[PDB]
Every structure is written in C-alpha cells, then in structure tokens.
Symmetry: D2
Subunit: 402 residues, 4 copies
C-alpha cells in the first residue's frame, strides 16, 4: 500500500513504475575488486581491519556484498589478482589459465567479469613511465602485458557469454614541469597501436582507454590525457572510459555523456567520489550522480553506457563500501527512471523554462523511498539500514577471524 | 495521504526524530526575500527579457504578497535603498530618510513581516568609476558615507516600528577590471570610510550591521576592494556581522564549511543564498547538495536563531513569482531535511570512529519520506501542496500580471 | 653592444639568435577587428573614448596598431563587418562583394584575412539557440549564413593568395539546467554536416569550430562543448580552434597542443586573458602564454598552429590594447625560441629532473629585453614604452576628435 | 661584465629607481629555509627516492651550510620538533627542552642565522586517529598541548640566544577523510586547546606564535579542523600571527590578494611559499606570476619587516641542495624584481584612471634587464654567478653526498 500510494503519484505523470523497476532489474554494475584487499593482490607482493588475504577470502567478500545489492552484476578484475600457483609469473606472461578459478566462480554465480592490465607497483613502472617510457625494452614489456590482458578479456567473454570490457589505465606522466609533452605522447600512441593490432570479436572483448588529469607524483603532466584518449579512441574504434574523479575542478562527466554518444556509440564510465583529488571515495547519491543517471536514462543509453564502480576507502567496512556505493548508483538510475522526460523536453523545446525548473525541483520530494524499498524486497536484499545488520554479523564471525 | 504522513512519522520516530517538533520549529524560521527580483532591479529613482515585471511599488507589493501566498510560514522582505518612495520628487541618496519607506513599513506591519535593508552603491553617477567607499576623491567617499549612515537610520527605523531587528547590509561594487598597482590603499580607504559609517551607535534591538564580501563581479574581475579576509577582520575587530553569499566565493569554496568557524567568534552570521553557475550568476536556489549542507550546519549547530537567512537571486528569464516561490520553498525544504536527521546518533558515531555507520546512515536518510512530511507541512500552512502552486501562478499571470 | 653581449649568452647554449629572429619575422598573428569599435560592426541596425564608428575609422585604427607591432600579420574579420552599400542585406545574403573593400585594403598592406560568421546580436539568435534552435526555419537561416561565410572565406584566400580560416562560433546554450543535453547537439551536428557539404580548396579556405564552456545567459550548458567539437572536427577533417579563456578553472590550452598535433596536423588558436570568466582581457606575457609558446616551438608547429587574438577591453585605449596584446604573444614566441630545447629534452629523457628544473628556471632571468629591443629596431617599430608616445599623439589629434 | 650591469642600472635610473638602494635593502631580508627538505621529513626521533639524503644532525647541518654557500644574503632555518638531538636517549615530545636543541643554537650562532620552530603533530602514535588538538580524548589533547607549550618554551630559548625572535608556528593535521556529521565541536576543541597552549605567557621579544590553516590533506580530504576562517578569527582575537601557505588554498585562490587585507589589521605576518600542483604538493618554488605578485605586495605595502618569509617545500626526487637553492634564489629574484618597479608612477596612474599606462608599463617591465642586476647582486654577495652553482652541487654530491 505504501508502494501503491507512491505508484499513483508517479502514475499521474505517465510514469510506469513497474516498467522502470523491470528495466532496472536488468542493468549490470561492474564492482571493482580492489576495494576488498586494499589494492593488494596475490602477485607475490592502521586501516579498518580484516581485509581479504587471499582470493578465497576475496570471493567470499564479494558474494556477501553482492547479496546485499539488488540485481545481477559484474566483477571488475585486475591483472594483479592472478592465481599463479605458488609459481610467480611475470606480467607479460599472464594467460587465461591464471583466471580459471575466477571465471569458474563467476559462471557459477552468473556474473560478468571485466579486466584491467596492471601498470603500477612494479620494478618496470618505478620511473613513472610505462607505455611512454623512453626505454624500448620497458615499453615492450608493458605492450606485452596489455596484449596478454586483451586475450584474457577474450577468454572471459567467451566463457561468460557476455563481452568483457578490458580497460587500459597507465600512471604515465611527470611530477614537475616537463620540457617536452609531445614525444612521450607519441610513444604512447605507438604503444597502443601495437597493443590493439590483433583483432578480437567485439562479442568477447571490448577495449577502453582511461585518462587522468593528475596523480600523486604526476602532478604536472599526464601522458594519456583527455584530448589524447578522446582522439585516439576516436580514430581506432575503441571505447573511452571516463572517471568522475579524473578531471578539472568543477568539470562534470554528466556534461560529456551526450556529446560522446553522438560519435562513439559505446562509452565506459567509472564512478568514484573525488574530494579534491582522484581520491576514490565511496560513491554517494549526490547531484552529479543524479545528473549522470539522468543523462544515461534520458539519452536512451542503458545498453550503451557500461557503468562501473571505482573506489577505495580503507577507513571503513569494505563490504559496506561496495554496498553503499553500488546501492547508490542504482538508486540514482531509479530516480532518473521516475522522471517526466517527455513533458520536460517539450517544455524546454517550447521555451517554458519556468516549469522545467519548478518540476525538476518538485520531483526531488516525490517518494523515491517507497519504490526504492519495494524494489529491494522484490530483489531479496535488506531494505533500509537493515543491511548493516548482515555486515555486523558477518564481520564478527568471519571478517574478524583472520 | 494523512496515512502517508502518519507512516512517515513512525519511520522518523524510530530514530528519536520528532516530526511534530521539527514542524513547529520550522514554522517560525524567517527567510528574508529580496525585492530585487520583482522589478528586474529597477527601483523608483529619477533614473526584451521575460514579460510582466513589476513597475510601481503597488505592483511590487502585490507581487510580493502573491509569492508569500505560495510560501509556507511567515517571512521578511529585503529592501534596497533605490526602492525608496519619494513622491515624484527627486531626493539624492544621501538625503534619504525614514519618511521614504513609510508605505513599506506600514505594509510589512499589516502583513506581519520583517524588513531588512540595503544601501545602494551601484548604478549612479558617483559609482561610474567602479569605486565608491574607496574612491580617490573625498567628496565621492563622503557622499557614500552619508548614504550608508542614512541607511543605518532607516534600518533603526524599521526595527523600532516592526519590533523585530533589521539587518542593514553593506555591499559595494568597488574593484578594478584589470591588474591593480596597489591593493592596500583602496582597502585602507574602505576601512576608514566604514569607521565613519559605524561611528554613531544604534540600539541592537533595532538595527544590526552587516558587510558583504565578493571575490569578483563583471567589470571587476581582477580585484575587489571588499574582499573576504578584509570583511572578516573588520567585523571581528568592530563587532559587526559578516554576511556570506553562496555565490561570492572561489571555485569549489563552500559556505557550509565556514559557518562552524564563524559561530565560535561572532555569535550571529547572515547568509545570502543564491546559485552560482560558474560565476556570481544569481540563479534561483535549488534543493541541492550545498543547500542541504548549509541547512545541516544551521540546524545541528543549533544556530537557528544565530543565522539570518536571506535569499539573493535574479532570474529574468522565468516567471518572477515562481522564481520567488521555488527559491524560498527550496531553502525551507532543506532546513526541514536537516531537522529530520539523527544528529545525536551521527555525532556519536563520529566521536567513536564509526565512519561506516555515519556514511551509511547519512546516505540512507536521502530516501526517507521527506516529501510526505513536506506536503503535510505545506497543507497545515495553507499553501498549494506540490506542483499546485504553479496553477495560481498561471492564473495570476493572465489575470493581473499581463494587463501591465 | 647590449644586444651583442646578450647574443653571446644565448650563443653559449648553441642558440642562434640571428636564426630565431629570421623565423620570428615570418610568423603571422591574426588580430581581431572587434577590439576597434567595441564589437559594433556596420549592420544597418560609459567606456573609454575614441572608438571607431565607421569602416574608414577602423581601417586607420588597425593601421595605427599594425605600425607599432613588429612584423607582418593578418586581420580577423566578422560578418557584421560587411559593407553593404547603405543597402541592408540579410546575413544569409551576404556575398564576397560585401567585403571587397576589406580585401583591396589588405592587398594594399600585405595582410592576410581571416573570417567568422556572426551568430549573435540578432532576432534570429534571441532565444539563445542558433544552429541548434528547434525551429527548422531558424537553423536553415544560420546554415545558409555560415555557407555564405565559407564562400567569403574562399574569396579571401583566392584574392590574397593565403588560405583564409573561417571559424564557426555559436552562443547556443541554456542559462538554467537543461532537461535534455542530447537533442540540441544532434542538431548542431546535422547543421554542421549541411554547412560543410560543399568542398572548398584548402589553399583558399579552411574551416574551424570553436568550443566554449559557458557565457552569460549561457551558464548551465552550451551545445558546442569541447567534446562535441573535438569529435566532430576529427570525424570531418576540420580544424579545432582553442580559446585560452574558454575552459575550466585551472584548465590549460598548453597541455592540449601536444596531443592535438598528434591527430590533426593543423590547429587553430585564440589568445584571451580569462580573469575568472571568458572576460577578454588583453593578453599579458604570462606563464600560460609562455607555456603555449614553448609548446608551439618545441613541437615544430609554427606553420601548424594558426595564432589568432581575441579580446575586448573597452576600459583602456583600444590601439594600446592591440599593441600590448600582440607584442606580448610575439614576445613569448621569442622567449621560446631562445630556449635550450635539446639539452632540456635530453635531461628529461635521462631522468636529470634537477638540471631541467634548474635551467628552465635560470632562463627566466636571461637578457630577453636586449634581444626583444634589437628586434623592434630592425622591424621599424618603437622600442620599449615609446610606442605609448605614438598612441598619445594619435589619441590627441585623431581619436579624441571623433 | 661590470658594464652590462652599468648599462642596466641606467635603464632603471630613468624611472627614478635607485638600483643601489634596492640591493642594499635586498641584502637585509632574511628567508627561512625549512629543514625537512634535507632528510625527506625524516627527523631524528628514536623510530625509490634520490640518494644522499641526510641521515644525521651533523650531515643535515653540513648540507644546510652548503645550500647557503650558494644563496646570497643572510638567512634563517626553520626547525621541526622531531629534529631534536637527544643523545642516545629517547625523550617523548611533551618532554622536549631547550637542551635538545643546544647544538642547533650553537651552530646557527656561529654562522649568524636566525631559527624558527614548529611543534610536530603528525607521524606519531598519538596522531593516528588523524585528530590531535581536537581529538575527543582529553589525555591526547593534553599530550599535544603539553608538547606545544614545550615548543613555545624552546622557541623562547631560540629568541634569547640568537638575539632575534623565533616564530613558532602551529600546524596540525586534524580532520576527517569523509563528510563529517559535526563541523563545530571539533573546532570547539581546537579553540580550547589553543587557549591553553597560549595561556602560558611568553616574551615576544624572543618568541612569536603563529597558526597555519590547510584546506585539505590526503586522509583529511572532506574537512580540516584548521579552517582558514577559524585561524583567521582566532589569530585576531588572541593577538597571534596568521601563517599563510601558498598551497593550502582553494583552486585559483591567491595569497597575494590576502596580504593587503591582512597587513591592515595585523601588523606582522608570516608566509610559507611552496609550489602547489593541484594539491598541497609541496613542489620547489618557481619564479612565477603568483611569486611575482606576492613580492610586489610585500614591497609596495612597505612590509619587508612585516612579512616573515619562510620556504616550505619537499621534492624527494631532485637533488635536495639544488631544491633549496633554486627555491630560495627565486623568492629573492622575485623580491628583487619587485624592488625594480616604478611603484610611484604606477600608483599615480591607478589613482588617476590611466589603466592604460598601468597595464602597459607593468608589462614592459617584464622584459627589463633583471638578469644584469641579479648577476651583479649574486657576485657582490659571494655566490655563484648564474647556473654555475650547479657546478658546486655536482662537486658536493660526488665527493660528499655519495660517501653515504
Ligand atoms: Mn580509475
């Protein structure tokens, strides 16, 4: 009845809530694994306690998170989460077999997997240059790692019968002012053209490139910038990936979505909260998230934007992290599904800016919670703060064994 | 629908949150609505947008009543010196006296309204250089000094008449388009000028003084005389109020963060809320992240009587009554939202280091049935309930607005 | 002597200053006409005194300034600068013959001409949409108008024997939050496709598109975003023009030149001084300005980056404005010419981040004035502040009498 | 070589600028070099980067003398509490005394340097919650209070011995990573802790106390207890100095605009210049627009004795002696540039409305022969001519920094 009352209110505007709920149920969010062991990894190498120690602990943790999150979703894996045996394999030598257990586990749970080559925390990545390193030998090693990484995506997609997105992000740049911006960039372009040389069926693997404005130790210059990647990706029929953390002060991904859809057709984004740097805070139901959802739903792009999460806070419960974050992007999608686009578009189309504002503003007090809650039941997940209870139980008996 | 309110009351009461208490408290927080919005900053001195602006004081007060109709609770009007009511008789700004705002006081009194006041230091001959209380020539400074001193008198006059104090705010355009060659002298001049304005004491039961900083405005982008650090220091040293403008700061600088620091040393602040979009653009206020953050500071620091909330936007691309009612209702919605947060629990989770619960519940509380509360609140208070206000605006626009 | 002493100091690094001056003599700088009459123009339908009012007054004003700016340059014209007879001709109906006095004059002074359709201050631009207005009859008007403009662009290149660049800039956006970001941009794209339908020889005309992030009344959203134009230009083999005042706080055009040049080949620019909004302050010899220049020089892009000026300061002497803004940008090119790029490239390549910083910093005190003053002597323009005298004269006798 | 200077001295002469005067005052102004840069914020408490970092007090002092070899003029060294010399002894921070800095004071005296001081409220067991003076735990609060008092005492000691006052600046890292649910009570506690630190009366002839705001740190991204607005109000009420750091501000935010407003209310003023690149990233100070604007401000406003200038930077990735010398020589160049600007004529033009000349000459001055003047100055002061100091750093790194 609570629900039922909410349903009518949306009804008056022609919003079909059941339809919205039915399409929402479908959309997959790709959850990053890094959150669970604090970017550790199993590659032979103070904060909130009981992070995962092993892939077995790591997988357990995801299932728990996943069981608190409505819908059916995906795990975004990194090259360093390889299960070599006890045998240490160098990164340019990674192969599908290194990911059997991951894949087998994903299939059992009916999940999709996404991949990323890992281009940091490594002997050959300490100069802060990787694909753009002045040393041929270093570039190859990294080129080979990415090529390897692409085949692993291909393995994933074949197996999971849903295309893997393999995304390249590199830490490349310099700390202080560079005396030359162009040539590293030329080295990066050449390196990529190599990485992407062999074709793979777009049914199994998709390729993305990710820019960053600045990082720690790359304050002043980043090789693979926005304009760089936007252009590169455009020439070579690849996907851009946009991180809500990697741009200028005041700069929004929401504003970029619709321009990008006119020329690209598929588009990847990682949502994370910047708090004044690519800080990787847990995603929150804020204005920019709402504006991103709005843009996604309105531009009829629920199958063209591959939503991924990217965030790392070690100060708080790692399961709560995943679940807060993921539950936020879904709520946001939902809110954007429950909005009168047609009346709103036709009002801006005809100059009535007055009601466009009034109504965008009024829907902020409509009963999202009554639909949000109903949805959570229908989807077998705890309904409000109830989900904290499961975390508490879980942390006690297992999270706090190790 | 009464059930909707009732179920929500249970949902909130489960936290210790008393929605009846919160609504009572909300009832009496006054918002000061700026008049600059009715007539496109036009005023009534000797001196192709959106149609049907206000054109006489009779039109601006009708307009104001009309918006006040649609806004819940009981409020204040923020007047500017250029909305002075002379006859058809030019009186210079330094010659301004209570008599020139008698019609307004009486109107406010009848409708049970507070009046705040503002000297006007833009759009005038002795402002044409873009310097004012800090102009190089004595006679220009002395003029704007006499004008501000006049405006303090008028504010004292409102306080006396309306038996609720009037904040007289001082904002000046002074600055330079391009890089300056001296940043001090003009500030020295501002200081000396303000010292002269605040010389005569006025009872604080009638009139409080504010000073408003700006980072930049157009024509005035390289440097502004009345800077943030300047007026922070001045108000402290001289026991005056800072007025803070949500629109008058750096990229990403938020006032929400400033309130706590300032309540520790000042005991009363003023705010002007407006929406900047990339500059002091003066957009209608929205229920957004920052407006809720401001509200949380006000409520949770128990500064509901310490923070004088006023609005300050000018949208002449949309209907002006609607402008008023959206903005004003948005801030009330925010205060409400802040009144329905489990502060005690949140504060305690912080002191304890339980950042998991703090974020989880802050976040959770963003889908609680705020609307059900708001709707009921709107109805006890005789305003249209959701979109409905938009229907009276449609009528008023044809009915009166557009025979004008 | 002074110059000969300076010369030796740069000569110690392998820096031939004689050669730098030789190449500096040949770089054109495209000066905007807007600055002369405060964007008035000659269409039938407070600030500092002495502003131009007539075609005749504006040509004298450009000549004055050109005569205080060393070298040979071009003038950048807008469509509202058409000289109909006393006739009145609609913007879609403008023809080469409406600019033939302009051409004759530049032939007479050895100047290139650049072009711009004007899509603002007009009835058919008053809803703030233009190439993207919902009304097809509005769009077509503007489509034709830009087409007319390209034809004029062709005229200049033919007549003057130097390609003309015809840059499109539109004011299109909304002040307040759009309820649709997608459908306005789809329309820009279709308008531009139509505009660029006819091919024109690259030796006579080039096209460029110019992004912007916001304007006044254009605050919340702007159709011609940076992502739209970069994508469009790349797909359609057109030039991107970048305006230093047209981006996010802390966002730098300098950082973009290097990547742009990897994919375009030809790049267009406008140098403005943003002061907290797109405000059009005279360009000053600043860090970003220097940085831009370095980037243009190291990258071997003097022929590849088309340097235009765009600013409008009505608060000072207008002839002063032009001469301060141009000499500055020349100045910066000079500065970058007198940089030990190869020793600096190497140290970067090599990891000697210490020398790099050290010497880039050390060059900020090198004897540029000496060189800059020599250059102005050889180029028959006044040498330090003495061009001010010539302004004071021109102001007394000519300007203050209109 | 001495005529290059001569020809240059004349060009400046024409504007009635006295270049001899300029250098004779430039010689006087002390810069305060931070010790952190020499050993990578190591310290000597009992607890991938460029090699040869300093590892002991003798080594760090030797390092320091090396950098002053190459920096013209006479200076000061900004010490941190953790650089205490306890023999083999292990003394806690609240237990720190003037004897634990005797070597330092003996050394600075022989080389004729002033010494500034900072307590250290990070890298400690009792600062792991990211809270310090604002921790909820009174004992922890007490502990740091105790430690701060201690360092005011040690600074006093510095003033007496070196016959010039020591600035003891307080910077704390207190804040939260994620959105807080209370911005006020944590600042209530800092206020209170500061009141205690400062209750112990200490002679200003010998020690001055400063307080340092930061906007965000990694791990304190959402909120810092030390608001700019908090310290700015604090220092004014309690007669202390604000210390301004060029990296602890909002994007586009400048210290150079804050100087004039501050000097007007404060008398004395400290700053740390560091290069921020998109965060308090502590890069080596470069001769840039903002460094140029700060120096103009200090010079024009007659403040060479009202602005205490310290360096604060740590770039672990270049030669650390180079870092000190590039940086210090830059602020000095900047000062020097500001000394060679026709302030009077420029001031007159602003006053007068001639923004045309104001802009034209400030720019024209950017190509005047600063290098000619700066070279002579360098020679006169017995430091390496130009780049030539890179030669002395290579000689030092080879036969010294790398016998480690
Ligand atoms: Mn990322």
């Amino acid at each position: 009845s609570q629900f039922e009352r909410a349903k009518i209110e949306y009804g008056q505007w022609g919003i079909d809530v059941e339809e919205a709920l039915e399409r929402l149920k479908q959309v997959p969010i790709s959850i990053h694994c890094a959150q669970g062991d604090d970017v550790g990894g199993f590659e032979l190498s103070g904060d909130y306690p009981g992070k995962a120690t092993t892939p077995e602990e790591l997988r357990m943790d995801l299932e728990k998170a996943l069981s608190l999150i409505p819908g059916k979703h995906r795990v975004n894996l990194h090259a360093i989460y390889a299960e070599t045996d006890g045998k240490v394999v160098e990164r340019d030598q990674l192969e599908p077999r290194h990911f059997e257990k991951w894949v087998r586990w994903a299939k059992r749970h009916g999940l999709g997997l996404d991949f990323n080559p890992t281009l940091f925390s490594h002997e050959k990545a300490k100069d802060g240059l990787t694909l753009a390193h002045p040393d041929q030998a270093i570039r190859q090693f990294w080129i080979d790692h990415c090529i390897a990484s692409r085949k692993i995506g291909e393995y994933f997609g074949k197996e999971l019968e849903t295309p893997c997105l393999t995304n390249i992000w590199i830490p490349d740049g310099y700390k202080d002012t560079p005396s030359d911006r162009l040539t590293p960039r030329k080295r990066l372009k050449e390196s990529l053209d190599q990485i992407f040389a062999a074709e793979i069926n777009e049914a199994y693997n998709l390729d993305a490139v990710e820019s960053k404005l600045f990082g720690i130790g790359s304050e002043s210059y980043v090789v693979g910038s926005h304009e760089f990647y936007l252009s590169y990706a455009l020439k070579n029929d690849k996907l851009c990936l946009l991180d809500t953390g990697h741009y200028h002060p005041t700069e929004t991904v929401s504003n970029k979505i619709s321009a990008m859809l006119l020329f690209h057709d598929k588009l990847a984004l990682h949502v994370s909260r910047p708090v004044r740097w690519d800080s990787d805070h847990v995603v929150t139901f804020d204005d920019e998230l709402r504006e991103i959802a709005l843009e996604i739903v309105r531009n009829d792009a629920l199958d063209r934007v591959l939503i991924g999460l990217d965030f790392f806070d070690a100060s708080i419960n790692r399961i709560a992290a995943w679940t807060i974050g993921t539950r936020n992007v879904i709520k946001a999608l939902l809110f954007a599904m429950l909005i009168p686009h047609k009346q709103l578009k036709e009002w801006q189309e005809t100059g009535d800016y007055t009601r466009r504002l009034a109504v965008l503003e009024e829907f902020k007090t409509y009963p999202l919670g009554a639909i949000w809650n109903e949805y959570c039941e229908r989807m077998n997940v705890p309904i409000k703060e109830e989900w904290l209870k499961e975390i508490a139980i879980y942390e006690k008996e297992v999270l706090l064994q190790r």
